[PDB]
Design an enzyme around this catalytic site. Sequence first.
Site, short mmCIF file in Angstrom:
data_model
loop_
_atom_site.label_atom_id
_atom_site.label_comp_id
_atom_site.label_asym_id
_atom_site.label_seq_id
_atom_site.Cartn_x
_atom_site.Cartn_y
_atom_site.Cartn_z
N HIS A 156 13.01 -13.99 28.68
CA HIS A 156 14.19 -13.58 28.96
C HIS A 156 15.18 -14.66 28.08
O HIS A 156 15.95 -14.62 27.99
CB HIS A 156 14.16 -13.85 30.15
CG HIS A 156 15.15 -13.43 31.13
ND1 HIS A 156 17.31 -13.51 30.68
CD2 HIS A 156 15.73 -13.31 32.42
CE1 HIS A 156 17.52 -12.71 31.43
NE2 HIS A 156 16.81 -12.85 32.55
N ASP A 159 18.71 6.73 23.17
CA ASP A 159 18.39 8.47 22.34
C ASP A 159 17.83 7.93 20.07
O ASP A 159 18.66 7.62 19.65
CB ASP A 159 19.93 9.14 22.18
CG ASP A 159 19.08 10.62 20.79
OD1 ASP A 159 18.20 10.62 21.03
OD2 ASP A 159 19.84 11.87 21.71
#
Length: 440
Positions: free
Chosen positions: A165, A386
Amino acid sequence: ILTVLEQSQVSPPPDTLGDKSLQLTFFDFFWLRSPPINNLFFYELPITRSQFTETVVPNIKHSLSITLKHFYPFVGKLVVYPAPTKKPEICYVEGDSVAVTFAECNLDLNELTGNHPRNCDKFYDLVPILGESTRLSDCIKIPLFSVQVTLFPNQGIAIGITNHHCLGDASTRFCFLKAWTSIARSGNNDESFLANGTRPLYDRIIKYPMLDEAYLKRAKVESFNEDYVTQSLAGPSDKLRATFILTRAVINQLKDRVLAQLPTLEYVSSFTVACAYIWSCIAKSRNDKLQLFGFPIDRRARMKPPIPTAYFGNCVGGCAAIAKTNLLIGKEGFITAAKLIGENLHKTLTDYKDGVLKDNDLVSEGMPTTMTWVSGTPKLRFYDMDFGWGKPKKLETVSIDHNGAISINSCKESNEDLEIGVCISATQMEDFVHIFDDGL
């Protein structure tokens, strides 16, 4: 079940990046002791083993390599020093690489990409370990980012992404993945990214060193080296993972219910209503005493002055509400939940406007018997990532299994619908499904 095909290491291209540091703020230091984040992207495509090896493997390596030259911290490490005075930082050194595992899974992909209850532990060997720390005399170095690409022969591909994180927030992750996929989609070329894409801003424009020092003290940096241990998810477990859909139409119906019953409630959104509804289901499922429910807030645009979207790193806040469980159950419970969430969020956003940066109270006021924190921001469209095979069939945030956490994201046949991921024990999942469905 699980076959490891290649354990590779991917670096930025030769002669592109020198040694580089990135200095961190209190926003980053807050996460020093967090467990890793694990995300899965599932794709459907009729891919053979030979094709996977021939083009997918080199395509992943090549496109990631190119992306890394624009995103140096992703291939860097978190460096923490025992000196109370030398602040943690991200360091990239020439020779540093990203661990990329290529694997093959013999499970039916259709048994993993559905929304109904599936064993949480079926997902663990699809996500990479963060990676072993390097312990030196003067410091500890922790990897920030790792990848696993798993072939489901004749069915598709899962991309598993594990990060620390401290590397950055959801927004940083999003920015990286946009670039990587653009570079991938366009045949391992950063031309389109450099011309049209959003480049990371590494300028250190959040300057609050007194806050920096206070956040580090809280995260006990002096004993970090001695305390730090790896935290990978591992089976077996009886817990089940499921995905719950709140459609645009249902959200708006719930919202109208809130606006009609509480006409002066100052804050009502699709998101607060979704949280309200799931909060209420969790209350009925647990039938416990006292509950806390909270979620992160991207603070970039609410900073004084505002922080550019492209800012690299963490710039996150949070909002929490606490209610007695009896008050959160049923049709009225959802209304109460929405009230409390809306009031706390309104207060939190008011505080940011006034420039307020900061924020065992529970031992006094009462210990919650359930705590839930949301992983996710529906605004960031991870469902459009994508790499050249089309958009993902399914996203799963696997790290919710570690603690009191659920995931909330946009769907992506529709960006106005919400998907909520839950991993809970098998005994509770049965009732939870009925509770969620019946209440709609």
